[model samples]
Target chain A: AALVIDNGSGMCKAGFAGDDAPRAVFPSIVGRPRHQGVMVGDSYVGDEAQSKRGILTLKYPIEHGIVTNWDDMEKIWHHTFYNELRVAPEEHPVLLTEAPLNPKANREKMTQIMFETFNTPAMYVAIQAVLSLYASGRTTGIVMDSGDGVTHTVPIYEGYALPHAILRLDLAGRDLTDYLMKILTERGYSFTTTAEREIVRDIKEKLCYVALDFEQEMATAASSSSLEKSYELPDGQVITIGNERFRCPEALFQPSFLGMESCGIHETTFNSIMKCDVDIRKDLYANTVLSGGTTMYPGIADRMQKEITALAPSTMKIKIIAPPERKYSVWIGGSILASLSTFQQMWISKQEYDESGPSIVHRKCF
Target chain B: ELSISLSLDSPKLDESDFILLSVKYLEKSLGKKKEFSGFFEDIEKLYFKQNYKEAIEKILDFCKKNESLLSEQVVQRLAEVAPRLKSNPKDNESRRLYETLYADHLESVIKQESDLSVFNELRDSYNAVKPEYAVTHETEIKTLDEAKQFILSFVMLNDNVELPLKAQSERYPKKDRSREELGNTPSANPGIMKPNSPNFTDNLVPVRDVPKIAINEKVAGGYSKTKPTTPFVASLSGTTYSLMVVLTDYIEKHKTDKDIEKKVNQIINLWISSYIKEGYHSYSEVVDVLTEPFLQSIFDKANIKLNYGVLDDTHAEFRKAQDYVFGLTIQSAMHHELQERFKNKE
Candidate 1:
């Protein structure tokens, strides 16, 4: 069976007949509506929960991409999964994709809901990092996914996980959008969430690239002589950025201008490999892969290669691979696994299911 | 059919089947088929295959299936075999088990773990220093990020605040740093305080320009009908008047008689007997030691315990009580001092 996924922040993902991502994506956050037991068009979703239209909103209950609040989350997950799938739980076994190193408590909560609430028979939970690595057709390469809320680098070794290399820097597209807003405000250009966020974010998505030399880029953009640093926002509004120079995600590499201690990218990447295992540090530079939304930034991989090579030993080799549609590698891996012959082995038997109960399934997945 | 094979060093956890035979020939022990069911099969498979993970899963499953069959002791024993049950050292159950095994039962698993590496060395050091702490100091720490931010700001502003200089021990971890520092700090001035009693008392006795009710005011606390009706108020000598009012208030509160003349005579005699006079230096000594009459009385009361800071030898007194009464009717000691000063000037 083929699985389709739209991992919406506001929607919970589920499979067509199972509790997996092929069926539906419910709004990511859990919150009460203005009216109880009544779904409204204006009801709270993951992103819309904080609207104080007389109800409460809690942000990022799935912080660092794992379920945090269990009680409120169960109701929301049910509303999204089987409700959208239009199927009863008894007939279908689940194959869900979960966050790498998903907390044990969250797993138990998810499994308990499936068994007690929906009478699910079995489950096969896999980390997105594992699936993404399988999708890339590389047994020993790193997957660096800079998502909307967090940047994570998951290292792989021979189709297995070395989870310790999971380096997470607490910044992402949301942070960039915030920074863009701040920059526009400081420049005396007023904009609101209703009018300007989509316009600004669209421009950032399409045009922004990391600067090779930030001050030089700023100088270029600042000069009236150059047309290189201007971009058209949505709604035909022209925004001129970078006074005489260009500024971009280079701030991630050199954060000092924003009153932050500058962290060296070369050292960080090397340290990321070293964190995998002291023994594997020598081999990590041999097979490095850059995959994510942020990797699409022009010259990012080139710049990272140049920076990382300097930190490596002279005898060692370094490579950066950008596979086709790398953003969906995790979903692609899930699709590939769904087609496996012994994939049934990956799932527990119905007898084992009844014997172990939902709670034990939670433990295995965790 | 039941058959058995045993090896000292064979893989023990993988056998899916059970092997059983009687060891003793004389005593026959019959085994029923169902009685030799999945129990030993499960145990042999788990032990021979080294399937610790599955063993743990099965144990948990068994506990869930027959919860009443499992005691807290059973769970604890399982925890001993499968250490992953204590993976979260911070969890309440895990921590409780750890405390029981290590803290209560010494020379056991904890001691074994401790002897392996630098962890053992650290444990030893911790154990060695665990007792004999007579004094303990701890910072009251607030975990909120804003509280930490406030502390950072406090460090930035510490120099400007009028915080007294803290001694080294106070800063390091003393009970009361501020009080101790205050206790040890030196006084500002180190000279004697000037007296307020006899100097002004003598000044009052002289009759350069007496007030309308000067005599009555002077005898107010000592007399009834002839005493002053209004409070002492005199210009050019306002301070002297104010001082006298305060003194008279004390006298009125404590005195029984209404005769200022007798009181004055008694005060003079007391001062003359108590204080020493040895020429030029003695005058200044008298002025330094003297205070207002009420203050002098307090000092005298304190002197019943210890001789310190009281009326000096410059005060006047006759040798006998009759002499004092007669002198009060005759001589004004204050006037006598003024006359002596006039003669010396000539």
Candidate 2:
């Protein structure tokens, strides 16, 4: 009855409501052929981009939690609806979650497309952070969403986000992966640089860990070679390493290691909470939540618990939730809520957008 | 059943039961046997006169005179030859129209038993087309319909097909790896060995493919079209119409059984094909009884704790099948109408 599309900067998760999971998480990429001629080729999208990247100049529809190119963004969304999900967009009410602090004009562009181009019956434009907040079944929280391209924190209370408190960081999964790739080259690993690009991502996911106590783990690094684990490259070479494991994940905790001087993830969460009103400050700490693909690393939640608790002296419970669906919680919430009886009133009808102005969606959502 | 004992009187044969055919057929049975060589001239006289019944009767008299010379195998082959030719010639109208009309009743009956004895002995299993394994033709060549059956059976018997090999494939331009040039046309080459779709090689990029559904619109309200979405939905026929009735009945009838989910497919083969085979009107009657009600039942049953987005897919499969049923009934209605007007047309 409803289609939920969680358009993250990295992956766009789309599927039906009442379903447990999204059908496929398509990478937010569009690729056009490099050559120019009458040999005229089709543009590659989502899963099509990675394999065709050698011959195609890759581009992103979305950048840093904002819809950049409307034409490119339209094709990827069209691909998700018509080409992938294999459903008519006009048939089901679409529930789209946009990133927080997104331009109002972007929502207007999507609304016109949803109504005019797609013939969408009804649509609801909601913040992806608030959607993740609903995934925890909570009304007030600070959602630290660190995905592939964008890392941001939002202090939303009862579906209302503190506009000034919402913060964005430049350092994210893409930057960390680049850092890991650079480190792998300097260490002289038996792997090709750009050829085996994913060999570095494999090391980051397999060997890296956010140390609960980063300074102590590095201090005891020499004596305890217990952390050293042998790893295999994509080329079948095995290389043993110790400190590189915590060293990579340490970039999230101590951004100074990468010399980015960006605040740590837990500090970002606390800093956003402090900007909220005094009444909701302790409430925000009690409902701190982790979301996005980047936050699913090992010991990330436990490390957040240690760092955030050490920074505060409040008597309230400083709870942090790391849901099983943390990697796709924004998608999960839309799927759960969109089909409910209560969500019927929340949707922005097509006629309403036609009669009123473009600002109706932003006003109707908040 | 005519029998004349040697002690009784003259020999009797060809009593509608035993009428001999040609010398060629007779030769295969007892044609040149040395035991019957003595009376060959006596039978040859009657054979030249064209009194084939009298000719075979004279041979029987010689056989009765020397019964000790005959073997059981030859005797048995002769005994099984009567009914083979009994009514064979009675079906010919020209024979009955000629001297047959003027002759007395008994006279025509007597002529009827004159000649024809190649019944089971002429046992020809195939005709009009050559049998692959047979040494000789069993049946006489008849019609094109016979040839059609022979050709179709050969295809069913021979499962695998082969074609002539193409020449050297060692060609590649510097610019592109994908194929642009072509190969043989249909008539010049059998081209029976057509390659399968190169889709299996597409695992280099991960993606999902859905079956092309022509009628994807909803059953009732939502987005829909007047005519069928495309010709692809016309895939169903009277066969598809009947199977849905029987199986849909089986599902509705046993839809209440515990673990019916497990048993739903147990009766899929239970569609006995007898439902529509009852008559043309049987499918038209059963399928047209309640379609929307069948859809309603699906909606109600699926609404109860159903899993995996049951709304759209079930609606579509039933829609195409239902559309074909509509296609068949109208075609059927036009059939009797066309037949009537044709018998009335110039």
Candidate 3:
């Protein structure tokens, strides 16, 4: 039996025996202080490292879905990783996920270190989100991954690797959270910057909604004097986000209005979907699949359908599949990959590393 | 040939302890080898370089290279030095050395990083003053070049007039250089004026910069002595008398040119006009808020360079004596001005 590791750019999820989910979730980050030694937020995992002194988190070493400073990260990966897995380093093959079109230098080093240190017999690494798409059984679908730093929509074609099929914009969950925090600040509400950011982010996730003709929806809500979203904080000061709240979320309508450099999300998404060379690219109506944490919004599927269908022709049939608990779809893909028999074939065996060397492995897999 | 591996097998030794041991081990081994120079000399002649991050590796390298070395002592010294080296970038002379090696790029970086005030102050004091160092892209490059040249060859030209010598320094005791003193005169311009102000014709004159009012002050007696009184409390009819006192003192000490004094009078007149708008008298209460920033604006408009640093020794003396005399006269004049306006008996 093989252990599949869904090493995401944002997270790593893995486990074996199918008894339960991945044993741990470690943020992908590494940092060195302005003064001394390199550090990873390894101590913070599982709450053992929590202390009164605030932890200085070094954010996103795998920034923008790519490995950036791996020299310090390799030691972090080897040490904290096994501790989280709980499974001792043994002879069994381990399946890991890597970004597709990953840099060659990184691939060589990762393969070398895993073999040399762990002495693992075999390992397989693949793109986590792609596997999730495959596991979803969507033949010609789009995977919109909205991670902390960036959002990428990858269109899968029929049995072919389309190198340029991935389209990315700067909008992500982090950006929306920051925008919400800014609204709170402009309204004369003051809190510590990061604390305020976290609070407003919580509020957005709990209450924000999407509606077709959001302007009209907001107008109705505003005119009805129904500000159900109003709340009093511990200080007893009331803050109201009326139908005017839609204007705040509609920042995605034209992000530049919010001092953001990117174009609106709808235009960017339309452009990206149209860029796919597949036959469905011309008829985006039938083949659009929105899969990610962001797709879980209440009216998102309907809103995407309405907005996208307008951009395409009137005759095209548009459908948006809201994958169940879309937030865990990528992990589900990892689970599906672990269950697949053919997935074992993709790994590099330890015997092969001993006899044939890293050069052959790099040539074949990378 | 010495390479040290740090292992936990020596549980008694901490990380720092291991580092010390490694350094000592290389130093002792190298010292013994040096005694047999016949065996080690040829190998020692080889060129060597390394890219090691660990401090222990570097210490070991020093021990290996020099046979008879103060190994542990040297490592300790380096450890002591590390904190200072990392904390203060200025402590490391290598960066400054690199800048000096490529002078032009260093100047550009310095100018880009610093504001104009700091840059000029630094440039003027530099003995190896280079024109290019002061050139900021924000201003026309030629202007900076010319400004530096003007300051360097800057000469204060004065005739036989008994005006104040731009007192270069008080280093000359007043008794020693009484001949150098440019004494008080009726109407002499102190050379420098605010940039682009009417008196800013030439670069030679030393203008008095405006004084900065402290944002918050705790004055004794709760009375602001140096400032002007409000026209409402001081009254409208005696506004001219109050203005005359301040002007008389300034004119006597400054001996400023005719046109400049006229401009000063105009500013004073406008200041008085703001108090008695539509004859509802409201002057005394307005003194605290009105005089300070309002006078600061007047200085700005007049282009009077009167900042703290701009006050030379002579200007300081003049203002010290002049402020009290003018302040008292203005107070007395205002007492009359208010009563006269109220009684309609100016």
Using lDDT, give the best candidate's number. 2
lDDT of residue A106 for candidate 1: 54
Off by over 4 Å in 2: A37-41, A190-192, A314-316, B1-346
All candidates: DockQ = 0.00, 0.00, 0.00
lDDT by residue (tens digit), candidate 2, B1-346: 0111110111221222122222222333465687655455444433322245565565555545654555544444454443232222212111111111112222222224322112111123212122344234344324322322222232221211100100111110111111322222111000110011010110012112212222233333211122111111111123322233333444455556564443322221111112221111111122222232443354257332212111112222222222222222222232223334335524
Worst 10 residues of 2 chain B by lDDT: B188-197
User: How well does candidate 2 match the true structure in TM-score terms?
Assistant: 0.50
lDDT of 2 at A232: 70
**Mind giving the per-residue lDDT tens digits that candidate 3 earns over B45-80?**
110000112544455456545535544554454444
Instruction: Indicate the worst ten consecutive residues by lDDT in candidate 3 chain B.
Output: B192-201
Q: After superposition, how far is residue B27 of candidate 3 from its true place, in Å?
A: 58
Winner on TM-score (1 vs 2): 2
Report lDDT (Cα) of residue A217, candidate 3. 85
For candidate 1, write residues A222-330 as lDDT tens digits. 6655534566666676766653122446655765535557364445567667555433555567666665565566667777777777777776678866555565555
Fold similarity of candidate 1's chain A to the true chain A, as a TM-score = 0.79
